[PDB]
Design a protein around this ligand. Structure first.
Ligand SMILES: [Zn+2]
Lengths: 42, 145, 63, 44
């Protein structure tokens, strides 16, 4: 559900603030969904 | 006898690599940090109060490291990429030493923040100063900046 | 950005001759002869490999 | 920075003069410098 600057994801929700509780970093990244994605190769 | 175009070019090119390509704002800022800044604060001298006993002498200012206090005040070091990504201000605190002069006599110098001053990129106070390409890359910037 | 796979005008394979091109020139061997030793007839297809920049060796080191 | 710092020194002027009538001894100093001033006038 997340990530930051050079490591691993995090769980969902929130209540107080938002920093990565694994890096101490402040930025979160929503990874691309692993589902199906058809890109019409022109 | 004769220097030819190519060699002259080598001269210029050397000037370019060695000196700064756009460091015009840079030398000026580097001078603003050391020489200047201190001038405005040494010229205004003291301050108030309307009651003549107290006085406060302004000493010399020091420029801290680029940091920011996020939610509910929490001092964390900041890099330019973090500032651009978070809509923050790439700046550092300015700490001034001030001397409480009561009845004529001085109390003791006290170090206190003044606010926050925006740092120019790749300047002296700028966290990117003496960093190699790999460290800039690790930061999230291109060495071409 | 990694050799334009194939070519533009001459639209044939050319990516597959990137490494050996570069590496052959990276010893002093003039590119205009290296190319000749490989499948590089017309200049239109030659241009695509001559004036390439491979910016990717900057972009990956990110995300 | 000159003008911004001027606004600071002035707000500190009002501050110290007005916050006294509430004669402070241990007035070690200076919980009365509202730093944001210098910041704002430079940022904005
Ligand atoms: Zn061609």
């Amino acid at each position: 559900c997340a990530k930051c600057g050079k490591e691993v994801e995090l769980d969902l929700a929130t209540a107080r603030e938002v920093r990565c509780p694994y890096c101490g970093s402040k930025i979160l990244y929503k990874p691309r969904p692993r589902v199906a994605r058809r890109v019409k190769a022109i | 006898p004769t220097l030819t175009p190519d060699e002259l070019w080598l001269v210029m090119e050397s000037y370019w690599k060695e000196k700064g390509f756009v460091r015009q704002h840079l030398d000026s800022y580097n001078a603003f940090i050391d020489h200047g800044l201190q001038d405005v604060v040494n010229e205004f001298g003291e301050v108030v109060p309307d009651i003549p006993n107290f006085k406060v002498k302004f000493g010399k200012i020091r420029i801290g490291q680029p940091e920011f206090q996020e939610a509910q005040g929490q001092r964390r070091p900041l890099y330019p990429m973090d500032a651009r990504i978070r809509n923050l201000t790439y700046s550092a605190p300015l700490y001034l030493e001030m001397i409480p002069v009561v009845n004529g006599i001085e109390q003791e110098p006290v170090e206190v923040r003044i606010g926050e001053l925006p740092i120019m990129l790749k300047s002296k106070a700028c966290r990117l100063y003496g960093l190699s390409d790999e460290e800039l890359i690790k930061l999230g910037e291109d060495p071409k900046d | 950005m990694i050799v334009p796979v194939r070519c533009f005008t001459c639209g044939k394979v050319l990516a597959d001759k990137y490494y050996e091109f570069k590496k052959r020139v990276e010893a002093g061997e003039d590119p205009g002869k290296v190319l000749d030793d490989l499948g590089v007839e017309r200049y239109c297809c030659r241009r695509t490999l001559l004036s390439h920049v491979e910016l990717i060796d900057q972009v990956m080191v990110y995300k | 920075f000159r003008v911004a710092f001027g606004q600071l020194v002035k707000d500190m002027q009002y501050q110290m003069t007005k916050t006294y009538q509430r004669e402070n001894i241990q007035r070690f100093v200076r919980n009365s410098i509202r730093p944001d001033v210098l910041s704002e006038r430079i940022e904005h």
